[PDB]
């Protein structure tokens, strides 16, 4: 019974990282002069 | 106290270095910290002058931002960048001015004029350019 639930563990599995944690990444966006007209530029 | 200092070298900063015809990615930190100052200096009102002859002004600060967009600098942000230029030395050669004829026998290390007792807040740190003198 409780033999199998107390001998079936196998050591805590260790995570092998695919990708790294990301959280931020780069998007291109269109910005405008004081004026407030288009600079045909993205950054 | 230090925090003028940074005012003062940051006020030459934008006097000297914003030229027509530089690259902006040369002054990229200093637009910056330009406009992260006005953002800080604005929307408050200094007094100054009241003992002995000294002409007593007010000051109040509404002002823009300098834009962040042109690949090249051109003649109207250096005209623009001036105007607010000659507005703040003004302040600071008129709060040293105050400051210098007005002494305590006791404490002397600690801000005498309105203008840098006001200074001393921990609002007013979010300038403090470099102590290099």
Redesign the interface.
Known sequence: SILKKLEDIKPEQAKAQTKLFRIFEPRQKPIYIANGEKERRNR | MDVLYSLSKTLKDARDKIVEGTLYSNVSDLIQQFNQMIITMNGNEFQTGGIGNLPIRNWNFNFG???T??LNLDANYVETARNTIDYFVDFVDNVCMDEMVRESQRNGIAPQSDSLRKLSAIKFKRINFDNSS
């Open positions: 931002l300098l834009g967009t042109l």
